[PDB]
Design an enzyme around this catalytic site. Structure first.
Site, PDB file in Angstrom:
ATOM      1  CG  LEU A   1      -1.884  -1.025   1.117  1.00 49.40           C
ATOM      2  CD1 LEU A   1      -2.745  -1.091   2.832  1.00 49.40           C
ATOM      3  CD2 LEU A   1      -3.077  -0.828   0.181  1.00 49.40           C
ATOM      4  N   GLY A   2       1.816   1.232   0.761  1.00 44.12           N
ATOM      5  CA  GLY A   2       2.859   2.334   0.725  1.00 44.12           C
ATOM      6  C   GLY A   2       4.108   2.313   1.606  1.00 44.12           C
ATOM      7  CE  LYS A   3      11.233   2.174   0.746  1.00 46.14           C
ATOM      8  NZ  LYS A   3      11.593   0.997   1.717  1.00 46.14           N
TER       9      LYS A   3
ATOM     10  CG  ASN B   1       7.761   7.638   9.124  1.00 42.72           C
ATOM     11  OD1 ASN B   1       7.712   7.162  10.009  1.00 42.72           O
ATOM     12  ND2 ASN B   1       6.611   8.287   8.445  1.00 42.72           N
ATOM     13  CG  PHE B   2      12.593   4.732   9.738  1.00 46.06           C
ATOM     14  CD1 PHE B   2      13.885   4.931   8.830  1.00 46.06           C
ATOM     15  CD2 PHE B   2      12.709   5.581  10.885  1.00 46.06           C
ATOM     16  CE1 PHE B   2      14.554   6.009   8.962  1.00 46.06           C
ATOM     17  CE2 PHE B   2      13.609   6.489  10.834  1.00 46.06           C
ATOM     18  CZ  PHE B   2      14.601   6.648  10.187  1.00 46.06           C
ATOM     19  N   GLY B   3       8.921   2.431   7.678  1.00 45.59           N
ATOM     20  CA  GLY B   3       7.850   1.683   7.795  1.00 45.59           C
ATOM     21  C   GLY B   3       7.341   1.542   6.259  1.00 45.59           C
TER      22      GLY B   3
ATOM     23  CE  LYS C   1       4.116   2.208  10.715  1.00 45.59           C
ATOM     24  NZ  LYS C   1       3.571   3.582  11.161  1.00 45.59           N
TER      25      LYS C   1
ATOM     26  CG  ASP D   1       4.126  12.604   9.381  1.00 40.51           C
ATOM     27  OD1 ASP D   1       4.358  13.566   8.690  1.00 40.51           O
ATOM     28  OD2 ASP D   1       4.374  11.504   9.164  1.00 40.51           O
TER      29      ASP D   1
HETATM   30  C1  LIG Z   1      -3.849   1.620   8.188  1.00 43.11           C
HETATM   31  C2  LIG Z   1      -4.091   1.730   6.686  1.00 43.11           C
HETATM   32  C3  LIG Z   1      -5.459   1.095   6.465  1.00 43.11           C
HETATM   33  N1  LIG Z   1      -5.804   1.201   5.230  1.00 43.11           N
HETATM   34  C4  LIG Z   1      -5.256   1.850   4.329  1.00 43.11           C
HETATM   35  N2  LIG Z   1      -5.855   1.880   2.799  1.00 43.11           N
HETATM   36  C5  LIG Z   1      -5.230   2.048   1.590  1.00 43.11           C
HETATM   37  C6  LIG Z   1      -5.854   1.923   0.412  1.00 43.11           C
HETATM   38  C7  LIG Z   1      -5.568   2.196  -0.905  1.00 43.11           C
HETATM   39  F1  LIG Z   1      -6.137   2.035  -1.901  1.00 43.11           F
HETATM   40  C8  LIG Z   1      -4.039   2.564  -0.920  1.00 43.11           C
HETATM   41  C9  LIG Z   1      -3.456   3.293  -2.143  1.00 43.11           C
HETATM   42  C10 LIG Z   1      -4.019   4.031  -2.874  1.00 43.11           C
HETATM   43  C11 LIG Z   1      -2.969   4.648  -3.926  1.00 43.11           C
HETATM   44  N3  LIG Z   1      -2.286   3.552  -4.583  1.00 43.11           N
HETATM   45  C12 LIG Z   1      -1.163   4.075  -4.778  1.00 43.11           C
HETATM   46  C13 LIG Z   1      -2.509   2.177  -4.355  1.00 43.11           C
HETATM   47  C14 LIG Z   1      -3.272   1.991  -3.169  1.00 43.11           C
HETATM   48  C15 LIG Z   1      -3.395   2.848   0.196  1.00 43.11           C
HETATM   49  F2  LIG Z   1      -2.010   3.498   0.310  1.00 43.11           F
HETATM   50  C16 LIG Z   1      -3.803   2.607   1.545  1.00 43.11           C
HETATM   51  N4  LIG Z   1      -4.091   2.465   4.398  1.00 43.11           N
HETATM   52  C17 LIG Z   1      -3.640   2.302   5.711  1.00 43.11           C
HETATM   53  N5  LIG Z   1      -2.327   2.666   5.815  1.00 43.11           N
HETATM   54  C18 LIG Z   1      -1.167   3.202   5.173  1.00 43.11           C
HETATM   55  C19 LIG Z   1      -1.345   3.153   3.907  1.00 43.11           C
HETATM   56  C20 LIG Z   1      -0.587   3.501   2.875  1.00 43.11           C
HETATM   57  C21 LIG Z   1       0.581   4.423   3.475  1.00 43.11           C
HETATM   58  F3  LIG Z   1       1.610   4.667   2.824  1.00 43.11           F
HETATM   59  C22 LIG Z   1       0.737   4.302   4.925  1.00 43.11           C
HETATM   60  N6  LIG Z   1       1.804   4.798   5.523  1.00 43.11           N
HETATM   61  C23 LIG Z   1       3.025   3.990   6.149  1.00 43.11           C
HETATM   62  C24 LIG Z   1       4.035   4.346   5.390  1.00 43.11           C
HETATM   63  C25 LIG Z   1       3.900   5.896   5.106  1.00 43.11           C
HETATM   64  S1  LIG Z   1       2.374   6.453   5.735  1.00 43.11           S
HETATM   65  O1  LIG Z   1       2.529   6.366   6.979  1.00 43.11           O
HETATM   66  O2  LIG Z   1       1.431   6.794   4.888  1.00 43.11           O
HETATM   67  C26 LIG Z   1      -0.453   3.678   5.663  1.00 43.11           C
END
Ligand SMILES: Cc1cnc(Nc2cc(F)c(C3CCN(C)CC3)c(F)c2)nc1Nc1ccc(F)c(N2CCCS2(=O)=O)c1
Length: 289
Positions: free
Chosen positions: A13-15, A17-19, A40, A134
């Site tokens: 889903l994402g990358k 700060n260290f996570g 995470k 943040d």
């Molecule tokens: C806890 C949580 C629950 N559900 C979701 N749903 C979610 C649903 C999605 F379709 C997307 C994307 C939408 C955009 N394209 C690229 C693909 C899928 C998505 F990114 C997330 N995400 C959560 N957390 C989260 C997600 C992403 C993060 F980078 C970070 N981070 C920890 C490192 C930096 S951060 O702190 O931002 C926390």
């Protein structure tokens, strides 16, 4: 609570700060009845990161609020190394991406609904003496069209009992274009610096994440794009002490921009409280309806 043999990888889903965070399916019966969750993990399980990650897990577990992402559990293997934090999965992703993709259906009343939810979440954090550190739209998640949640607590610190600020300098690069001046100069973080960052979040929302209008682009244009390296921070500091500010976004009413500029007070003690921010935003929202 969760056993990793049942944690089934679906996508990253994402990358950050260290996570990193992955969308997984927890399917202990292995019959496709399990629920999709967010997982995470650390990308380098050193010990400062493991102890800070344990602090983050404990902080998230202690929070229960409609506008805070839900903790579900932890999962470890090989004796408590590779700790993973299990959270609810929110299907619409970050508020930044959501707003960018639906900018022509989201009017000002809806932006203020999101704003008021963010202020209630932040006030609840303040009652526990947590400093988020943040706050940004990329860090707010969307559960549905009517509900957002504050979502990444990797930088959250607990205030010392005898002071109202927390001094922290971490190795890393820092979202300086969301940082209050006293956070840039003295590494001091407080409820009032969270209020500064919230003002920047309000700005973001009302720009609808237009590319040239982001705080980094606006600030780099204001100080000059020739600034390069550490020296950038220096110029930013002067820009804020001479009361240079992000401009009023296109279409933003004057009342909303005034809320923003009141959150960008150089004087830490003259910034509004999150309760007042919520009150003003709710009264404007009622006026518009
Ligand atoms: C806890 C949580 C629950 N559900 C979701 N749903 C979610 C649903 C999605 F379709 C997307 C994307 C939408 C955009 N394209 C690229 C693909 C899928 C998505 F990114 C997330 N995400 C959560 N957390 C989260 C997600 C992403 C993060 F980078 C970070 N981070 C920890 C490192 C930096 S951060 O702190 O931002 C926390």
């Amino acid at each position: 609570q969760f056993e990793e043999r049942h944690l089934k990888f679906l996508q990253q889903l994402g990358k950050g700060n260290f996570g990193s965070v992955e969308m997984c399916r927890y399917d202990p019966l292995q019959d496709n009845t399990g629920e999709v969750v967010a997982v995470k993990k650390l990308q380098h399980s050193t010990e400062e990161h493991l102890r800070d990650f344990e602090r983050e897990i404990e902080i998230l577990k202690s929070l229960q609020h409609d506008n805070i992402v839900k903790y579900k559990g932890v999962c470890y293997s090989a004796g408590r190394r590779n700790l993973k934090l299990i959270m609810e999965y929110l299907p619409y992703g970050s508020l930044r991406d959501y707003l960018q993709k639906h900018k022509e259906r989201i009017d000002h009343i809806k932006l203020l609904q999101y704003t008021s939810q963010i202020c209630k979440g932040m006030e609840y954090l303040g009652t526990k003496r947590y400093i988020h550190r943040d706050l940004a739209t990329r860090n707010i998640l969307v559960e549905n069209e009517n509900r957002v949640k504050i979502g990444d607590f990797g930088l959250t610190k607990v205030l010392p009992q005898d002071k109202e600020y927390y001094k922290v300098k971490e190795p890393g690069e820092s979202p300086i274009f969301w940082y209050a001046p006293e956070s840039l100069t003295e590494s001091k973080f407080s409820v009032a610096s969270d209020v500064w960052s919230f003002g920047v979040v309000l700005y973001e929302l009302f720009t609808y994440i237009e590319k040239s209008k982001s705080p980094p682009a606006e600030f780099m244009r204001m100080i000059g794009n020739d600034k390069q390296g550490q020296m950038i921070v220096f110029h930013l500091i002067e820009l804020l002490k001479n009361n240079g500010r992000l401009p009023r976004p296109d279409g933003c009413p004057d009342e909303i921009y005034m809320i923003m500029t009141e959150c960008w007070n150089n004087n830490v003690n003259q910034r509004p409280s999150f309760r007042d921010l919520a009150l003003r935003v709710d009264q404007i929202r009622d006026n518009m309806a």
